[PDB]
Design a protein around this ligand. Sequence first.
Ligand SMILES: *[C@@H]1O[C@H](CO)[C@@H](O[C@@H]2O[C@H](CO)[C@@H](O[C@@H]3O[C@H](CO)[C@@H](O)[C@H](O)[C@@H]3O)[C@H](O)[C@H]2NC(C)=O)[C@H](O)[C@H]1NC(C)=O
Ligand SMILES: *[C@@H]1O[C@H](CO)[C@@H](O[C@@H]2O[C@H](CO)[C@@H](O[C@@H]3O[C@H](CO)[C@@H](O)[C@H](O)[C@@H]3O)[C@H](O)[C@H]2NC(C)=O)[C@H](O)[C@H]1NC(C)=O
Ligand SMILES: *[C@@H]1O[C@H](CO)[C@@H](O[C@@H]2O[C@H](CO)[C@@H](O[C@@H]3O[C@H](CO)[C@@H](O)[C@H](O)[C@@H]3O)[C@H](O)[C@H]2NC(C)=O)[C@H](O)[C@H]1NC(C)=O
Ligand SMILES: *[C@@H]1O[C@H](CO)[C@@H](O[C@@H]2O[C@H](CO)[C@@H](O[C@@H]3O[C@H](CO)[C@@H](O)[C@H](O)[C@@H]3O)[C@H](O)[C@H]2NC(C)=O)[C@H](O)[C@H]1NC(C)=O
Ligand SMILES: *[C@@H]1O[C@H](CO)[C@@H](O)[C@H](O)[C@H]1NC(C)=O
Ligand SMILES: *[C@@H]1O[C@H](CO)[C@@H](O)[C@H](O)[C@H]1NC(C)=O
Length: 1374
Amino acid sequence: LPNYLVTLPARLNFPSVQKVCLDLSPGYSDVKFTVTLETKDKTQKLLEYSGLKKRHLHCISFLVPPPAGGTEEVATIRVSGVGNNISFEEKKKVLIQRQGNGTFVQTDKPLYTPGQQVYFRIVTMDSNFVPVNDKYSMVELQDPNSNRIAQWLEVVPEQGIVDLSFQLAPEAMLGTYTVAVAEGKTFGTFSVEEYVLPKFKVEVVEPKELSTVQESFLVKICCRYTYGKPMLGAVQVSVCQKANTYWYREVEREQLPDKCRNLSGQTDKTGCFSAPVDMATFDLIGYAYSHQINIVATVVEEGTGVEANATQNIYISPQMGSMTFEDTSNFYHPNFPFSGKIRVRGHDDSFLKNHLVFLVIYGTNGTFNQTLVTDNNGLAPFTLETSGWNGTDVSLEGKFQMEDLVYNPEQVPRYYQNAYLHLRPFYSTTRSFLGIHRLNGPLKCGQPQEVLVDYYIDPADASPDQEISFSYYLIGKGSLVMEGQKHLNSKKKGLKASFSLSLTFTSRLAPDPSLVIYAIFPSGGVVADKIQFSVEMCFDNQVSLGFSPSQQLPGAEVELQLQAAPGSLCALRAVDESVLLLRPDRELSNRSVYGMFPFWYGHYPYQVAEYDQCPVSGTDLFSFFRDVGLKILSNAKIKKPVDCSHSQVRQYFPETWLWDLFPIGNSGKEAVHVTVPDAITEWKAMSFCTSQSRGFGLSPTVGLTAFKPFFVDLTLPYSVVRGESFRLTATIFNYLKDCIRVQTDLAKSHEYQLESWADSQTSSCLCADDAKTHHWNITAVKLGHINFTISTKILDSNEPCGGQKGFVPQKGRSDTLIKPVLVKPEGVLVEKTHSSLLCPKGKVASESVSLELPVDIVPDSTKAYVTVLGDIMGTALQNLDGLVQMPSGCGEQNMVLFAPIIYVLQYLEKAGLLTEEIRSRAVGFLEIGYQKELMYKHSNGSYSAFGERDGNGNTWLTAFVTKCFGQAQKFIFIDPKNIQDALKWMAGNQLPSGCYANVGNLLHTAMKGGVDDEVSLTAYVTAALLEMGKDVDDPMVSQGLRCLKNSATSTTNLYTQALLAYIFSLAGEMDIRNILLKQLDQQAIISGESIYWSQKPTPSSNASPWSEPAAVDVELTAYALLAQLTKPSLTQKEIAKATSIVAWLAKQHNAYGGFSSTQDTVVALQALAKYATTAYMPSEEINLVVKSTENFQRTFNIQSVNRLVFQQDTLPNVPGMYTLEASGQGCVYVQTVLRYNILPPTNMKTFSLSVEIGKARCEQPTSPRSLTLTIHTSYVGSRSSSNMAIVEVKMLSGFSPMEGTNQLLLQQPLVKKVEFGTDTLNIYLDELIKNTQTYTFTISQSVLVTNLKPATIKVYDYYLPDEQATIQYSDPCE
Ligand SMILES: *[C@@H]1O[C@H](CO)[C@@H](O[C@@H]2O[C@H](CO)[C@@H](O[C@@H]3O[C@H](CO)[C@@H](O)[C@H](O)[C@@H]3O)[C@H](O)[C@H]2NC(C)=O)[C@H](O)[C@H]1NC(C)=O
Ligand SMILES: *[C@@H]1O[C@H](CO)[C@@H](O[C@@H]2O[C@H](CO)[C@@H](O[C@@H]3O[C@H](CO)[C@@H](O)[C@H](O)[C@@H]3O)[C@H](O)[C@H]2NC(C)=O)[C@H](O)[C@H]1NC(C)=O
Ligand SMILES: *[C@@H]1O[C@H](CO)[C@@H](O[C@@H]2O[C@H](CO)[C@@H](O[C@@H]3O[C@H](CO)[C@@H](O)[C@H](O)[C@@H]3O)[C@H](O)[C@H]2NC(C)=O)[C@H](O)[C@H]1NC(C)=O
Ligand SMILES: *[C@@H]1O[C@H](CO)[C@@H](O[C@@H]2O[C@H](CO)[C@@H](O[C@@H]3O[C@H](CO)[C@@H](O)[C@H](O)[C@@H]3O)[C@H](O)[C@H]2NC(C)=O)[C@H](O)[C@H]1NC(C)=O
Ligand SMILES: *[C@@H]1O[C@H](CO)[C@@H](O)[C@H](O)[C@H]1NC(C)=O
Ligand SMILES: *[C@@H]1O[C@H](CO)[C@@H](O)[C@H](O)[C@H]1NC(C)=O
């Protein structure tokens, strides 16, 4: 009878196109076939084909119909063949399933410091490696507290690629961040910590995984600096084996002592110490000790005493070798030779060449032995004659050695990993053979490959005149790739010959494709073979990367050759090799891209898995197609009839070098020139590109070696004082093989004095892996930043440098390093500010400033300038990042750089002056503020002044922060979970009377501005809510307002009156606003035309022209000015009263648009924003006249175009009298700023301040000097307790706080946060009482500076700069 064979994949993908094949044996000229696909919605007639007079295999392709269930659906494949007298039908079940899309997220590094800009990319592709260009609903970024800190909505890719960036905050939240795409369904993570710290690295070079067969192993501990030069010092080693912890507990049993072997010694001139450690010390065998050796190496530097450690754990493994079966199947053909290979490896996986290995054959006819020898690739080929096997199962085992190893049973056994193979005979009803040659190695993709096919045809299955049709099949990834038929006429080649197949491996073919070849004889029998290949993981878009040249000096040019398909867009990544080495994670690799998709599935899915229905009552041709994911319908004898009776510590993470997108032109190649970085390290680079024509591509990881012959290092102090001598330490390092003559020149300048003088000139000779140190005594002369230029260069010297001539390379002859050092003047800088509001109403408006100088002025510190702007807010606009020159490290003090930006933008938007250049600058500032604040978020959602270092949230600061994040949603993104969880916690702390409890107090009495009771807070929380736009019908407002009505009846405090007047100006109860505003007028102090309020007693009448900002008065005056400006329609008499209040608040400014502290700088600029929003006028032309005594004059111009422009000019004239003269129409804000240095006055009016100095060993001149400071302070001021306190400890020149100075102070009383600065240590104290407090820490000297000038210890109330104290301290050995 004639046969048929229908095949199609068992798993059909809805985006993919699949094939269904039909293999017809001859004899169907009257029988018509129709292969239909029967689903739920339709019956799709796939293939419709009648038979021929010969054997003809006819495949078709078709589009997969949509699965009905949205995700997947089981359908029915039906094959029917209707003829004259023949009618038969057959069905199978198949699985249609939606394709998975695999999305990846690549960050430029996987570890960042805070303040670095994080760049990342997002591309979605399908299993055909085609980039998806659909829009994404939401890309958001999450911080370690899982607060949503940025989002981009409706991002459209460019050729499938999304390129995004985010600026980290310079102290941003430490930990693991999360990048979410498409509602959290696909994501990636990256880390942020502080690093780059170590000066040198202790490296354990020789430690590697050990084996119990070693008698001793050599521990090699090499110590080299971070730039690579060796370091001399003493080494101590601790090579221990700890006792294995055991779960069982028994009385009077102790853990065994750690078997150790301690070693000590010194490094050689390579920086390495080495000593063998015998394995007899450690119990290599007992369960009572752990199987790991722990090596602790601690190295103290020769001379300086700098200590560093290293820990490497070494697991011990007894395994000595492995063996695997490659190029073999799990089946065989009887009577014909079965070939294979045996791969043999040692304990380190090296290919063991010419190794005698034993192949043992287990069978029914006896145990037979063959000896094999391996080749240079570690492969041992064999061939077994299956004619003597009688068609039975044979179990194969490859052994290293024949006799079994004899070991003591208590001892840990070393074993050899044998290879095993179970062979089932292929059931054939024919006596023929079909056997396929297999190819060696992972095959190169795209190249045509010739595969040889051996065959024998027994004459009892087919006549020797009959033409023989072999049909072959090629499967990749569980789908049909290639098909064909090889016809062989048995007269031309005989009945024993071979043929070849010309195959080409593409990317759509799997990394493991399957070739199945079969032929049906007229008896219905089948003979087949199945072989799987190893292909390189390729892509249809060839992307290459290349550097030209691949080695270059730092600072020079280099050509970056980038190649892809035409029309491709490429995403470059150039990274320090240390970054790819320290986390070899899922960085983008060919294995990672294939790893996204389940390509390993090549079996029937369980929804359409074909089981053998056995009546349970209490390797053939079908098994080949199931093993490649192919369903099969056939009537030939294809199946066996069913029988039923049952990281590391290697290096730093510096700059991401290159991160750009490059489009590839029509040429297919693109070359750009990039400048090589100054750092001496090797750069690894990779590129990935997308094209709609060729799909995704990926490059090889190519390198660029930035190498310079010699490196120089500058050890310089940061800041020194005038009159001091410091030690400039310059070291010169040689990385070459040869000795070079080097001459190091210190550039002569008039800005410092050299004590070396003419002794500095020489030319010392420096050989290989060698270093020469150069020092200069430098007396500090000029004040300011002084550049120190050192030019070290290689000479063409003929003197004996090394024995032969001194080497001169042709590139890298002269290295020049320039490092500046600040020479700060003595004492403390003082600032004085006379800010003026001149509104020329057509007339000439005039004011006069007198620059009076004190007597004991530190020289050259005198500078003064004048700032002119067309806007009263404009001084704060230029210094939004620098409003207050104070530490901003608490929960509230950070908000001095968040709140004022929001009111400025609301003013500039409502006045329309908001440019995109300004909006882009400002928006980025708020993002840096938002991140710092979230470090003070608690887990419940509230905020405190120091985060979780406080026990609870603070009621007032949470209401203040919530006020700002809601109004920030109009400009930048804010997570609503932060707003809602702050409101959820504050609603819980609302008291029954509608007032708010002061959890964490109402803050300090000059911070808050007031204290009297809890009603004072009920004022602010309701005020903040209404600022946010909340309703009067809001439950937190309405119950809040109900508590504020009976307590507005008999209220006495001046602050509380001005605060309440703001609230009822927002609440709309004008009846109570006017009662409180009139109580303000009777307390108003009018000085000239200025109207302000003050809780402090009235001065005589004299207000100093220079700013003396009472933070009580400044904050208080704005809350009145705010209460005035919330009447929705303003009279010209109310505008003028607001104008009269303004003429005092604008005078108290500092040099940066700030005032004196946190809230007052916020509240007053918040008020002046509401005034400038109300009183905005585009100024026509204001012409300002500046006059001085000694022939100095200056004219500025202010129009509506430069209203916001910061215009500044310094006064060349010595301090005298100056005259403003404002003419035009508009208003011009003019500020006068004076600076000088005086000696710090020992003022002890509000705080007691003293300093004890602990005993340093002055008689030790080669010890890193330690000074132990003991500081005493107390609040002797008028009130009971102070506010939050700063202890500002300026350092001595060349000193630094020791390791653990943070952790020392935090345990000591009242300390909340310790902060080390550049040259100043700031300590936060909660408050200071009248009890003398004592705080002690130790500082050490890192750079020698002599003739030490005194540094300044300063203690001051943060929210009251007027309540301060200042002392000095000096070196006791000087
Ligand atoms: C893998 O990615 C593809 C490509 O984006 C996803 O297919 C797309 O899914 C969307 C949403 O279901 C389809 O848009 C819709 O079009 C219909 C008309 O057919 C319209 O009535 C809807 O309102 C909607 O706009 C889009 O056509 C479809 N694209 C293709 C080529 O079919 C697919 O869902 C992703 N698969 C997975 C598992 O994520
Ligand atoms: C290698 O050297 C480093 C640096 O000397 C060692 O790290 C240090 O370990 C000590 C002891 O645990 C830490 O001090 C402790 O800090 C906690 C708070 O963090 C405090 O409550 C304790 O009272 C104590 O002072 C110290 O912070 C830590 N330093 C750093 C920079 O991590 C490290 O343990 C050494 N490793 C080996 C194997 O020798
Ligand atoms: C993933 O891609 C990497 C490239 O980043 C592939 O690395 C390749 O590794 C092989 C094996 O070392 C190298 O193949 C050799 O090529 C020479 C001809 O240049 C040939 O004579 C040798 O017999 C050998 O086949 C190859 O140079 C290297 N690079 C590239 C670009 O192919 C890696 O194989 C890929 N991995 C997978 C699983 O596909
Ligand atoms: C101390 O040395 C540094 C060099 O390390 C000096 O800074 C340099 O100042 C010059 C000014 O002529 C800069 O040249 C120009 O800079 C501008 C601004 O970016 C640029 O548009 C020009 O194309 C040109 O390159 C030079 O780049 C700059 N170098 C650095 C690294 O900032 C500094 O002025 C010296 N200070 C003293 C007190 O000696
Ligand atoms: C530099 O010269 C000054 C002169 O007073 C001396 O005191 C100091 O010790 C010298 N330092 C070095 C490193 O030579
Ligand atoms: C958070 O607030 C709740 C009250 O809602 C309080 O019980 C809890 O102790 C607070 N936790 C912290 C860490 O502030």
